[PDB]
Amino acid sequence: MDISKPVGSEITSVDFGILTAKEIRNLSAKQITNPTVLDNLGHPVSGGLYDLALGAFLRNLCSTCGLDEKFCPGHQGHIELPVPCYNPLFFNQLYIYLRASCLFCHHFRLKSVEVHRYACKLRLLQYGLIDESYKLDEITDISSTLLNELKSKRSEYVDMAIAKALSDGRTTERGSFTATVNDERKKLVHEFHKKLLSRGKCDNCGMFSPKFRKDGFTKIFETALNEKQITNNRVKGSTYILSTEVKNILDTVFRKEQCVLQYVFHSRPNLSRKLVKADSFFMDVLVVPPTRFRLPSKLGEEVHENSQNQLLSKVLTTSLLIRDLNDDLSKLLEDRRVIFSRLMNAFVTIQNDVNAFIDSTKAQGVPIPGVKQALEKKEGLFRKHMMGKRVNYAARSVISPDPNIETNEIGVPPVFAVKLTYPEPVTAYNIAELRQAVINGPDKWPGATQIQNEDGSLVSLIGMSVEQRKALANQLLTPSSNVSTHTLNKKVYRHIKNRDVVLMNRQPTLHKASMMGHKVRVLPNEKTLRLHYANTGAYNADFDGDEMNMHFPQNENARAEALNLANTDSQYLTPTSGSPVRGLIQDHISAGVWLTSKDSFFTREQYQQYIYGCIRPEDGHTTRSKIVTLPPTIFKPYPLWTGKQIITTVLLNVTPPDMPGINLISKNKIKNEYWGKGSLENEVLFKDGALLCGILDKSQYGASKYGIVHSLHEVYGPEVAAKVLSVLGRLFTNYITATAFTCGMDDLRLTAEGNKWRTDILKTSVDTGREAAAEVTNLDKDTPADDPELLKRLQEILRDNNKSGILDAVTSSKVNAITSQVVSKCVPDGTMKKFPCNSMQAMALSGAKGSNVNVSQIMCLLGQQALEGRRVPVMVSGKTLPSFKPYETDAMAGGYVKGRFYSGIKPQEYYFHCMAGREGLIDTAVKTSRSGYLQRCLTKQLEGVHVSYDNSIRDADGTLVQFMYGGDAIDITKESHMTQFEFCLDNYYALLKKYNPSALIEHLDVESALKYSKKTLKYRKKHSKEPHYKQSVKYDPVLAKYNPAKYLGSVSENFQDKLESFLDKNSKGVNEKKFRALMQLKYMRSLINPGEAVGIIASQSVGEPSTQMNVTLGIPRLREIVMTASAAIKTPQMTLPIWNDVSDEQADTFCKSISKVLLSEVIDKVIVTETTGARSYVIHMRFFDNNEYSEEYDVSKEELQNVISNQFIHLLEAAIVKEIKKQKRVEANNNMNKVQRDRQSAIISHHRFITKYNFDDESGKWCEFKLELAADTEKLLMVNIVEEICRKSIIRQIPHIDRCVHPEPENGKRVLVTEGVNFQAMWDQEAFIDVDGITSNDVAAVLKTYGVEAARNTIVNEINNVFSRYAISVSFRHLDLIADMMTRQGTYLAFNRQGMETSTSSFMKMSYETTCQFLTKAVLDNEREQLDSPSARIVVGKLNNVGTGSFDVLAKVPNA
Amino acid sequence: IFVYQNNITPSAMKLVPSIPPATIETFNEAALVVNITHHELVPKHIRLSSDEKRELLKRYRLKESQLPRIQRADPVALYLGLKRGEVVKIIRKSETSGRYASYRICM
Amino acid sequence: NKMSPYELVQHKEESDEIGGYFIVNGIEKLIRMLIVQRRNHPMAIIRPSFANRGASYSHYGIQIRSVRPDQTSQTNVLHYLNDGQVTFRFSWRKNEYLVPVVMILKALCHTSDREIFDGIIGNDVKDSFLTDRLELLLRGFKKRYPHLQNRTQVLQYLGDKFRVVFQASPDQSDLEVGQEVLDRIVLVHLGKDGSQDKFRMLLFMIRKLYSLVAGECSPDNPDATQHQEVLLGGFLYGMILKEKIDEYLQNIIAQVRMDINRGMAINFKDKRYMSRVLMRVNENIGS
Amino acid sequence: GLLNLGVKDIGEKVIFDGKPGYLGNKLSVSVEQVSIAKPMSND
Amino acid sequence: KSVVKTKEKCPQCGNEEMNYHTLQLRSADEGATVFYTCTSCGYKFRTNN
Amino acid sequence: STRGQYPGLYLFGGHSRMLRPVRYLPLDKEDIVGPFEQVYMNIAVTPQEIQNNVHTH
RNA sequence: AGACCAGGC
Ligand SMILES: Nc1nc2c(ncn2[C@@H]2O[C@H](COP(=O)(O)CP(=O)(O)OP(=O)(O)O)[C@@H](O)[C@H]2O)c(=O)[nH]1
Ligand SMILES: [Mg+2]
Ligand SMILES: [Zn+2]
């Protein structure tokens, strides 16, 4: 792009139409006719694919415009297909209208009044009349006179409703097409096409039409009429058919029904009034592309012709064979049949070639790719060359770390400073320094490589000497001799200076702080980028070979955005949680522990050396033009300073004067007990900018909230906190290079007493693996390891996967409590060298690098080597390893390793630790690819949602997502210290300067929002003891009535109820009302700006923490909620609130009445007995004792009889008849009483082949019943039948609920969780369950029974606790927008291609996936789009409507 | 409105739209055992007047079809008895803001 | 081959130069080792993909990988159907084929039908799991194939169905093209003169497959290296060299097939015609 | 060697004539020995 | 219902802890051969009975 | 064993096996074993961890 | 411009 070459015209919209055959005979340059590409001697033959009329080809002028290779744009040509053929993009819709239509009267086969019912409902949906289309349907074998009276009043209602809505300011004559009327139109056309295809007779004239058949593509068949209903076509007084006849039918059907199909094929009102034709679905002319776009590839001599020339030649080869097959018919049975059977085969092969040119997967005969498959996937065209592109003016190199860089700069090599260049137009203020740059040349920094003249010409400085180059330096600021180019000036493409801007970038760009705008500083020596350590955690960049990108922006609109907007100093706080990402990392955190210690004393030469080593006033870090110091801590015998007093005057020089010092009371990671007795070094204390107590740590400087750098970011500003990270980064580097820091082998030793403490605890682990084994096996205690009953059941545990899980969770629970006894005892109390000298402990406690579990495995013991939940896997033989005997009950034999990294682990301990190490390297591989497609589905839907100037976030096409961002419209990166009222009171006079209350009253309304905020605060304290359904509120909050960005005091209700809760309690020359007047000004400035790409931020705040990762959990849970929106949820639950009246004994006998009881769960064994020669069976099902299952399942003896009577056998009788069908290809007497003989007689009567039945009526132990069959039948198994029926028969079941568990009470409340969702059946149990507190897990079932807003509340909590399990804090403003976007239609829509079909932006849907399915649906609808979405403004090259491009810039010119 | 025990004959479901302008609503006797607006996860739904519908489409300059949508057949619109094309004010509790009025229209 | 490290320096190579690799176009290629199923061991296998062979297929099954003495392999997977019968599965070309095993139990040797029973049932006749599943196996052969009573009649049916796919000759009878089925497919590590041993090993494999469906056996893990074997790469270089001379011996018949369908000047006893037609085929196997 | 055992495993392959019951002449063609040579050039 | 159911004195140098391993070689008719292996000297011998 | 691997005595002597040397404790010499063979025997990693009557190698 | 192979973070 050239800023000195404007453009006045802009694309406003696009619209997808069908390119007709009449246009592309006028459009065409020259029709091409023979299937030879280029002839001998390297020329292109005239009339072929490579032609000079189609463009300049290979050093030869064009025959249409007469231009060469560099200037010919390429021209459209065509071929003449001799027969109309099928367009494969429209064949699925051509086969709908080829079916469903009468072949005799040439209407559809519906009645003409119901086809008219859709003709005028779709007309109301072209305009913005989504509600008038349903009033139209409320208008009501039958004579055809009142049907004309019915079609009249329906047509007059539309012409009155369109006239009223267009007059009452609602709908343009171009119609209104929002998103929710695209829903009602797609729902109405799909209903119309489904009802067309299901018709027996034509309801206009009642006789049949032969049904068409499509087996695959390239062909259509019609079937012969049946031998029965040919009578209907005699009382009205298989075959391959031609594509000219299919067109001949639909050239009549679309004319007899023109008044209906105009609205099916138009989303908006047809102002052109063009006819819709059957020639749309056919293509009588192929268009060949311009020959520029099909140039051949070249690798030395290996020159191959393009794939499209291979596919367009085969169409031309068939297009001449089909004309040579017309030679004999032009001359004219045996002379006629062989010439016609070979002509019909040419019809199929010219179709199979026009399919294979357009779509390669519709071909047959690894295939040559068509024109559909240059667009579809990654490596397509929308995703490889439109949404992502290769760029100019951009470098990539390995990064090396660098101090002495001011935390917003990048260090560029000399060889990047030479190549990358910037167009500076010469002016009156450039010809001092831009004359010096052009003298220096292409190879002298700072220099220049080119000059662009006024004419668009461009003079390179590479092959020029310095005498030729100084003459061009006197050519720059000259008046132009051309009047036509008199306002243009020369551009000097100078090198990159130290004042330019640079956009750095490390892959994967998981969030927006992984692509920041840095300043530049060139460096003299080597070929690598130089990145400061505060940026290393934002890009997730380490220095073991990372390389990262460097994009150099090319105009002033982009330099002003990566210095002010995409700046690296503006990205201190991330918008995911509001937590900082920037800070010092490893050596600087270990140095502030030593510097801010009580031992650090500095003399006068040392104290003043560390200040000028970090401040350096000439580079502009001080604010006083003279370095001020403090009086020393000690005056006698000789003056000494302190490391507290280092950072006091470090912070005194970088702060702005006439603004008071910082006031902070915070804490740090190191406890008081590491510094001795009576230590106060845990709390830090800043009082008027002076560090008076406390070590400085990771919690103060470093990516951590509410430290000193986070507090300097709030009170003073982001330019100060980015400067403090520079000055402290140099204060600690210069302290380290004079006072260093080492970890050695000395730091890893325990004492001789601590090693004795270690081994005495580990001697109790020799019996731990046996006690845990004896507990699970249900032996009591003290059984030996070689007990044959212990070894028998351990073999039974191994063969089951669930029994082995409760053995690997009891031993792991016991051996991790032996690990927790050594770490509690041996560190820090048993270590030889101690804190602060123990550098292994000193950098683990301080958060520099390491953990407490890392120094555990080094110094104490390495622990249980846990696999994926379980312990180390066991072989088939019961051996965990060849070293250990089978089934031994040792903790060491199952993965608990006692050796430490200091003294070594054994070879069997080494092999267990390698199983756990490979587990981590696979989860680092396989679980960073599943979260990458989570964020892509999220960002495509949420690319266009943004804050409007109404403070009301909404999509790019205009549909409204929320009325206010988060309900309060405050930015996450500005609301950290918003409710830190104790911090803002201590820093009142310094925060009053940055908000400046007196100068900000004139553009405000201070008076009005405060009054209505008291009308509601007084109302809600008076009311709001009742619950929410009773509250007729009578007053909205001040956010819903007043603009919070203009009206002072228009705050949220939690901000008002927490300020009036803070300021009520404590009473502290600032009074009570000047503090509440400054928080409401702090609130209003912390509003979110209009234009914020919120949904990108909301989708990066979910996709980037997802990489950190008896119910489903994690990234499989986010796929169920967000990506698929599954109503077939994997493990649904339902939480039931127990009343306070029912106790724990009345609640767990209650959950035995909901949880299902199978018949399989009550049977001990089933003994069948088959005697044949009538096939007999004696089904004897033996139960447990009645005292055993009436306690366990609460199943009575008589209820178990009714399941066998009415439920078990009716499933068993079916399974025997089902198999006979599919194979055709001690106890009591018999004179017991009158009722059991008739209980038996009712079982025999109502069933098919039972001859005897008896239940154990006196004890409930057995049930025996004879079951005869015929002698004709062969053998059934009749045990695998009975077992499969016994597992499907239910004793007692509440439907869709399979289990009901009473867990421990989590967080006070009493909880009853089920394993299935049935809200209707849990409403009957009012006496046990709070029915008005039943929350759940199935988001699709809370939408069906409790509604839309309850499912919106359900989806927030379920996407919350998938992040709350990993202790990941993502704020409720990103979770709010993903909720309100998924339920924006009153349904539960997914972030996939099925849930985005209801959307206006066609290029957004085409860019995501299934490109030529959304392409066909756009061109069938004749869909015009306003180019609103960010995916649609990159395809056509527009500025976005988000952020900077969300407004226009106008220039006030003084003269009229 | 019309409350029934078990089911309605499909020849008798043709009669509930058979009269304009007076509408007929239809409820189970088992779906009315618990009122769902008393549940904790639902907000206070309030339908707006024709004047309050004009003042919402004027402050935000919305079309009628650009609001968030509520279905006509979810059990909260069936509770309030919503005819198509009218806005429901939804008083929503949140974690950091508290009360704020959202809106949905029933298409 | 037997050069000293002195003589390997005099021939420019390297002193302790280990070989192992192929020099192809100046680039040192080598064929990797592949870990694969053990030879000649029927292991009980549970796979959810065994159910997708059609309807009534269980997830159970057994699988042997038999290697020939020229180190070329052939798998013979037995499936268990939920109907009660079992199924022999193999693959001669890149498509699969399904045979009931009683067709193979009666084609290997001259059997009774109690000797099919006595080879699975030992002295455990009272085990009524096995007796009921072996009722359905032997009566399903009599139901579906009411013919095929002796060995010489089963073997002609098996040769009639695998004649065009095994590329048989018009000279071979159906009795001896059925033995051409049994020698290249079923349990090929016994070869010719081992049909007694192929019989006893099938009666072993059915009982182990019935011991797997009874729960009496754990399924053998194919991913543990207990049941794994190494393709050395040098043997796979010999496996592919069998095929390229199997294909070479077919191109010299596919060339005289092209001579039958076109020409007349054909004399099979003419050395002048042998060298005439053997130069028309692609003999460059080494490329 | 294993290649001679692979030569033997392929066996003989035949093809008959169309020249005139009997089918014609058998042509029972095979390979019976394979041997690799150490690499030799001709200069 | 399943779980509710409920020295050698080696003559070479003198050592009592001596590594042994019984192994029945040929049939169950003969006695198990006890293969002895020392660690203090390393002398090995076996024992029929 | 109860529901373990199908029992039997399997001898292997063919090509392409996997083989490692191990020291056999009665009559101390070298023994060569395979992966199918190793899963049911008790080797020890050092001769100071031999337990009596359980370790063969 | 694809295939396969070897890597980088
Ligand atoms: N998107 C991907 N990022 C990767 C991949 N490999 C490495 N990385 C990035 O490079 C960084 C490498 O970290 P590692 O995989 O080595 C985890 P490690 O335990 O070695 O961290 P340290 O011990 O702190 O070095 C990591 O932050 C990743 O963001 C990859 O395959 N894909
Ligand atoms: Mg790295
Ligand atoms: Zn041209």
Ligand SMILES: [Zn+2]
């Ligand atoms: Zn008709």
Ligand SMILES: [Zn+2]
């Ligand atoms: Zn001894």
